[PDB]
Structures are given as C-alpha cells and as structure tokens.
Chain A
Amino acid sequence: MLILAIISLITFVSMSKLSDNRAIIRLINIYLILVLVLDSFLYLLFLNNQTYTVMGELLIFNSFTFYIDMLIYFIMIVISSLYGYNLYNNNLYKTLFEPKKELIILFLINILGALLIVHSNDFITLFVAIELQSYSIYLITAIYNSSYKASKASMLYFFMGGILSILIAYSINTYYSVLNSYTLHSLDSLIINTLDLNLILIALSLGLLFKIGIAPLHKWLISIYENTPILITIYISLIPKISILSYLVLSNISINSLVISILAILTLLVGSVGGLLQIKIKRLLAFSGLTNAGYMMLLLLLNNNEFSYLYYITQYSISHLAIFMIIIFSIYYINYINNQYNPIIYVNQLKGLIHDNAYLVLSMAIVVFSFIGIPPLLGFFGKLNILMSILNNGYYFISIVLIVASLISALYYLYLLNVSIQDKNNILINSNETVSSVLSYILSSLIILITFGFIYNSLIIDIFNVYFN
C-alpha cells in the first residue's frame, strides 16, 4: 500500500500549490496510521515461524520481516509528523522547518526501497532495492539545494555509494560464477563445507556493511551527517541502518567471520574514542550511531539472533528518534541561531536548559541514560540481550571490548547532561506561544515507551515464543 500512496501522491502533488505542501504531509501521516491500525492483523498469517515466498522465489515473508516492516512504518509516522506539523506559529520557524514540494515523494520511494530489502530472497531484488534506496538518499540529501554543505554532502554520498554498490554487484556476480544460483536458500549448510564461499559471502557482507558506517570507512558518513540539515538527517541516519542490517541478520552468511569480528572490535573502539573531544551535537550524536551499529555487527557473527536484534532495533529507533526530537525543542531556548538549515550545532548552545523547560531536561536525561544502559530504562535490556547472545556462543574477547566501549561511550553521552544542567544568567520567565500539542505528545509517548517499557518484557517474550518458534 506504499505503491498506491506513491502513485496517488505524485499525481496529487503535481496539482497542488507550494503553500499546500505542508497539509499534504498531514494527509499522508494519517494514511500510514491506518495502515498500521486497520492492517496489523496479517500477523495471524505468521504462526509458528511459517515463512512465505511470494512472486516466485523472489520475496520472502516471515514475521521477522513483518516486524521490521511495522517498525519502519511507525518511525515514518513520526518523521512525517515532524515535517507536516508546525513547531510554533512564528515568522521564524516557517522559514527554518519548511518542507519542499517533492519531499514526501522521495520519502515514500525510500521506504519502498528499504522494505524491498528486508523482504528480499533474490539477489537482483536485493540489488534493485539497494539502488532504489540509494537514489532516494542521494535526492533527499540534495533536495535542500540552496545550501553549500548539503550539496557537497550529496556529491560525496553519490561517489561513496557508487563504489559500494559496484562492490555489492561484483560480489553477486562472483557468487554466480561459482554457482548457477541467486538465492542463499541454495546454500543449505552442506555446500559451505565443501565450497570456499568464505571470501565471496564476506565480501558481499562488507560491501553491504560499509554503507552503514562500519569503522574503517566511517569518516565520510560522519561528514554527511554533520553537513545535511537537522530534519533530513534523522531519516538518512535511521533507514539504511535498519534496512541493510535486518537484511544481513536475516541471512546468516558471516558466522565465525574473523573479518566481521575485527571490524566489530575496530568499530566499538574508534566509535567510543572517536566522539570524545567533539563539540558539535550532530557529530557527537553520529558517533553514537557508529557504536550502536557496532553492537549489530556482533549479532551478524551469531546464529539465531532474532531476539537480541529486534529488541535492540526498536530500542535504538525509539532512543535515536527521541534524542533527535529533543534538540529540535531546544532551539527556542538558545541565544544564537545560525545556519537556517541547521540551527543548533554546538553542544554548548543548550547550556541553560534546566532553568528553561526543566522537563525537557527530564526527557533528555531519560533518553540519554538509556543509551548508556541504565537498567530501569529500555536500553539496558537491549545491551543485556546482546550480551546473552555473545557469551552463549564463544565470543569472550568481544564481550569485554563491548563493555570497555560502553564505558568510554558513556562519557560523551553524559556530556549532554553536563552541559544541560548548568547555570544560565538569563532565564525565561514566560512565553507567549507554546509547542504543538500533537507534536509534543509524540515525544511524551516516546519517553513513556523508554521509561515504562521494561514492564512488557515478559509479555513480548511469550509473544516472541509463539510467532518465531
């Protein structure tokens, strides 16, 4: 039903004016909500890990992928509410947070390309869908074209995505040159013994992984995440991560991988010690993505990782989405707005935040202790259930390096708190205009999932016991 949305939408956007664009996104927001509500019941198809293959050995549908599908729709309902709703009714925030005409077009085409990977069985479905989502990230980066940094970032992202698309294509055709086959379904655990498919499947994994931000090739993605504006970057950070990783976690082609294990160690090291002496908030906030994409590369080495993965996915997605939404709200309280596309940059700009909207600091605290892994919060059971899979399966040096990486990464997480709970000379006493009710309810909902979401751990596991076993 994304197809019908795109086909209806681009015809509808061709006829609307510029001033209509905002309200169009509101429509699409509600549309996606009634694809969650009125169409969820398809989970009843997937009892006892019954898997389907649709369109003839082409798309594989299990309930792992159904959950990834539902997660991607939920986060788009959020991101679409960020574009489609005003923050305040000022003359300021209309020229700072304003959608383009064709923005929601590229959004839905991107989600289409990201779903056709997690649902994918074939390799040409994999390649066409990676190409579709890669074009969409090209154009979502370059759509705010009256910005020097965003155009430079779109060009950088074009060439570095072109190399790692031709590396994937070379790995697919290298796999074809030794097996007249397109599926990893053909592998079926006898062939891997008598066939040297190490170097092929590992090179395929790498060419898929370097697009995430794994650490030998991590600098260019941190540059794109700092150069893009503040609304584009909470989408292009989240979507290729969860799409490409839930591809590679579903098909288990790097087990006992020594190369994935080196790159997981190297990722947890230079992500935690990378973002220490840094002063820009999107930088600081983009090396948090490097370490938390490091905790996934561990699970690639695993067999049977579908609990640790999915729980830590929706953990990172809610925590991610919430900490980006908080520093949208701190823009009213800063004393200095530069750079219209990216209005808050330096992390010392949110300094007096406890004396002006103290419960924004309560919100910020609750989400940032969840990144560290504090046990009343939902981030801790995510790190816990990763640890239960790492220690089960023989990765003992990986585990202590995970722990040292978590301890180093707590420093620049707590730097946000250190800066936020400080004295400020000039405090706000009263504000005329207040924040959007339907948009601040989303942040309150995203906290109450993080705070009081350890409640349902038991229920989820029992539901997890039925539909995946």
Chain B
Amino acid sequence: IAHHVDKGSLYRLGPVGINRLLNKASYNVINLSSNTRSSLSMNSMLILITIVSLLLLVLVMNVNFIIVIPVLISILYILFS
C-alpha cells in the first residue's frame, strides 16, 4: 500500500501524473505554431481554418448535437496531443 497505492497510484491521479499530462499538452500547444519559417503565412492560414471550421461545426451542430461532441473531443485530442 505504501508503495503501489499511496506513492504509486494516488500520485498518478495526483501531482506526479498531472505534471506529465500538462508537460505533454503544453509541449503540443506550443509546438502548434512552430513549423513555418514565416509567421505571416502561418497566422494568415490559421485565420482561414477557424472561420472555416467553426462554420462547419455549426452546420453539423443544429442538426444533431450528439454527432458534434466526438468531433470536439477529437479536435481537443489533436490540438493538445
């Protein structure tokens, strides 16, 4: 208990697993704007995707709300990992 439960598994839901989760997620969302040599073309193509993608989400969304929850879970998965 003092190793596998107290210091093992309660820290993975505690401060030792949250550090690794936030480390990975922050590394992903910082490297999201990494690749391009030019900041202007990257930001100018990033303004396009949103006003495209938000509009498509709202197209999906007024029809059925259940079929847009996994789309947002997957966008969070690709943005944060």
**Which residues of A come within 8 Å of B, CB atoms?**
152, 155-156, 159-160, 163-164, 167, 199, 206, 210, 216-217, 219-220, 223, 258-259, 262, 269-270, 273-274, 276-278, 408, 411
Contact = CB atoms under 8 A, between A and B. Distances in A.
B26 A277 contact: yes
Nearest to B76: A269
A217 B43 contact: yes
B54 A259 contact: yes
Contacts of A219: 32-33, 42-43, 46
Contact of B43 (A160, A269, A273): A160
Given A155-B40, A220-B39, A163 B47 contact: yes
A270 B47 contact: no
Contacts of A164: 47
A151 to B, nearest CB: 13
B80 A273 contact: yes
Contact of B22 (A155, A160, A217, A408): A408
Given A219-B33, A259-B58, A274 B26 contact: yes
B72 interface: yes
A156 B46 CA distance: 13
Nearest to A283: B30
B50 interface: yes
Interface of B: 22-23, 25-27, 29-30, 32-33, 39-40, 42-44, 46-47, 49-51, 54, 57-58, 61, 72, 76, 79-80
A258 B50 contact: no
Contacts of B57: 262
Nearest to B21: A273
A129 B44 CA distance: 24
Given A156-B39, A159-B40, A217-B43, A270 B50 contact: no
B81 to A, nearest CB: 11
Nearest to B28: A273
Contacts of B61: 258
Given A219-B46, A276-B23, A276-B26, 10 more contacts: A199-B58, A217-B46, A219-B32, A220-B39, A220-B43, A262-B57, A270-B29, A270-B79, A277-B23, A277-B26
A276 B22 contact: yes
B30 A274 contact: yes
17 contacts: A152-B39, A155-B40, A160-B44, A160-B47, A164-B47, A167-B51, A217-B47, A217-B50, A219-B32, A258-B58, A262-B72, A270-B80, A274-B26, A274-B29, A276-B26, A278-B30, A411-B22
A411 B47 CA distance: 30
A199 B79 CA distance: 25
Question: Which 7 A-B residue pairs are closest in the complex by CB-CB distance?
Answer: A219-B33, A276-B26, A216-B50, A220-B43, A277-B26, A273-B25, A273-B26
Contacts of B43: 156, 160, 217, 219-220
B80 to A, nearest CB: 7
Contacts of B25: 273
B29 to A, nearest CB: 5
Contact of B27 (A210, A220, A277): A277
B72 to A, nearest CB: 7
B69 to A, nearest CB: 12
A219 B79 CA distance: 14
Nearest to A153: B39
Contact of A159 (B26, B44, B49, B79): B44
Contacts of A167: 51
Nearest to A159: B40
Nearest to B61: A258
B37 to A, nearest CB: 13
B10 to A, nearest CB: 18
Contacts of A277: 23, 26-27, 30
A210 to B, nearest CB: 8
Contacts of B42: 219
Contacts of A270: 29, 79-80
A274 B31 CA distance: 10
Contacts of B72: 262
Nearest to B43: A220
Contacts of A216: 46, 49-50, 54
A210 B50 CA distance: 11
A386 B54 CA distance: 26
Nearest to B23: A277
A206 B72 CA distance: 19
B54 A273 contact: no
A220 B49 CA distance: 15
A201 B72 CA distance: 23
A206 B53 CA distance: 14
A159 B49 CA distance: 17
Contacts of B44: 159-160, 163
A168 to B, nearest CB: 13
A69 B29 CA distance: 37
Contacts of A152: 39
